[PDB]
Copies of this chain bind each other. A is one copy, B any other.
Amino acid sequence: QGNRWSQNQVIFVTPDGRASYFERFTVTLQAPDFDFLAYPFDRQKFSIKVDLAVPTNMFIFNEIERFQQVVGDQLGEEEWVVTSYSQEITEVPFERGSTNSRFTTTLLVKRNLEYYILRIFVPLFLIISVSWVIFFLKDYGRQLEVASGNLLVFVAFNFT
């Protein structure tokens, strides 16, 4: 989506004819397969697809090289936690017939559950318990007043 930012882009060749390409990139990718129905307990897949722009009879992916760790570790916590990853080479239909190679990297991610749990569900449970406990009283004016206050407290927490 949009332009791609690239750094350290270089191509170098040896007299025998061995050539290699290197690039450091920052890119934005469309993900039409997202599904947030089970939010915040949803799980998502991050797929990165690289397609050759030439027919398979000219060039084709043959091997996968692991020059570094596929998923890198960084200091501090993250919003998304990677559970597993995979890499695969396949073939996809190409314009003007024939076929082109595709290299796909897939990441399985999930959210931080403790954040949502501790930040949302415990206070909501406490508010519900406050609304439930008032029925032991036999003075119904106090019960009505506390219920009226607790409804406003619930609304305040909801917008908070």
| A1: B residues at CB distance < 8 A | 5, 26
Q: State the Cβ distance, A37 to closest chain B Cβ, in Å.
A: 6
Chain A: interface residue count, which band?
35 or more
In the complex, which residues 61-110 of chain A have their Cβ closer than 8 Å to any Cβ of chain B?
74-77, 95-96
- Type the 1/0 row for A123-147, where 1 means its CB is closer than 8 Å to any CB of B: 0000000000000000001101110
The answer to whether B5 touches A75, judged by C-beta atoms less than 8 angstroms apart, is no
| A153: B residues at CB distance < 8 A | 148, 151-152, 155
| A145: B residues at CB distance < 8 A | 145
- Type the 1/0 row for A1-41, where 1 means its CB is closer than 8 Å to any CB of B: 11001001010100000000010001000001111110000
Q: Known contacts A142-B144, A148-B150; decide if A74 and B156 are in contact (CB<8 Å).
A: no
| A141: B residues at CB distance < 8 A | 142
The answer to whether B146 touches A144, judged by C-beta atoms less than 8 angstroms apart, is yes
| A37: B residues at CB distance < 8 A | 76-77
The answer to whether A5 touches B5, judged by C-beta atoms less than 8 angstroms apart, is no
Most buried by B among A26, A77, A153, A155: A155
Q: From B5, B22, B35, B160, give the contact of A95 (CB < 8 A).
A: B22
Apart from the given pairs A35-B77, A148-B150, A148-B153, 7 other A-B contacts in the complex at a CB distance below 8 Å: A22-B95, A34-B76, A37-B77, A141-B142, A144-B146, A149-B152, A156-B156
Q: List 6 A-B contacts (CB under 8 A).
A: A32-B75, A33-B74, A148-B149, A148-B153, A156-B159, A158-B160
